[PDB]
């Protein structure tokens, strides 16, 4: 009935990936791929690979019709954070968060 | 800006080296203290 794919600990901040994942939800898979291709953000290639992986393993493992799928749900979750520092004036240092994210997409019929 | 540390191999050896520590009773006292604490680097 359904298939899913996940990408774990991708080095991209969750907000910047959510802003793109929002406009793929509940769409036919071909339209969603086209939408991702023409959105000039840095999160589009990662989500495109996750979505195509989900379509591929739906086709292979469950023998579903790859021409009648829709994006059932897509979401972004927080992964572990890399802690860095930036030298500021007067001899002090400030914190930097290099955040990562887990990206999940699910596809199904109708 | 000229800062406080201006390195010199010879000056470092002559002020803080092993043979300078061994030449006074208080230097050998420093060496004994650092041996008692167990430090890997003496002088």
């Amino acid at each position: 009935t359904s298939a899913k794919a996940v990408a774990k600990t991708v080095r991209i901040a969750p907000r910047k990936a959510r802003i793109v994942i929002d406009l793929i939800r509940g769409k036919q898979v071909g339209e969603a791929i086209a939408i991702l291709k023409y959105t000039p953000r840095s999160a589009s290639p990662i989500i495109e690979k996750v979505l195509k992986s989900a379509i591929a393993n739906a086709e292979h493992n469950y023998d579903l019709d790859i021409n009648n799928l829709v994006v059932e749900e897509a979401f972004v979750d927080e992964g572990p954070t890399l802690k860095r520092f930036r030298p500021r004036a007067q001899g002090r240092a400030s914190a930097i968060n290099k955040r990562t994210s887990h990206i999940t997409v699910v596809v199904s019929e109708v | 800006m000229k800062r406080t540390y201006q390195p010199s191999k010879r000056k470092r050896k002559k002020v803080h080296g092993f043979r300078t520590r061994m030449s006074t009773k208080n230097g050998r006292r420093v060496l004994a203290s650092r041996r008692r604490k167990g430090r890997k680097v003496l002088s």
């Binding site: 802003i19 406009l23 339209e31 086209a34 291709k37 023409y38 959105t39 953000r41 | -």
Partner: protein, 53 residues
């Protein structure tokens, strides 16, 4: 210069109402049937106005 009070979750979510982004202006190619932007060359066949580019 400095925030007097911390911001609540509801206030932050209200301010983030308009920080979404739009949906691309695309349609299907008359030649190859693929999706493409209007007034742009088709990247899948190199067509524009029904001619090779």
């Amino acid at each position: 210069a400095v925030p007097f009070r911390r911001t609540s979750k509801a206030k932050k979510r209200k301010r983030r109402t308009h920080v979404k982004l739009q949906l691309p202006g695309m349609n299907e190619c008359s030649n190859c049937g693929e999706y493409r932007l209007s007034h742009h060359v088709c990247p899948e066949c190199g067509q524009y106005d029904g001619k090779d580019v």
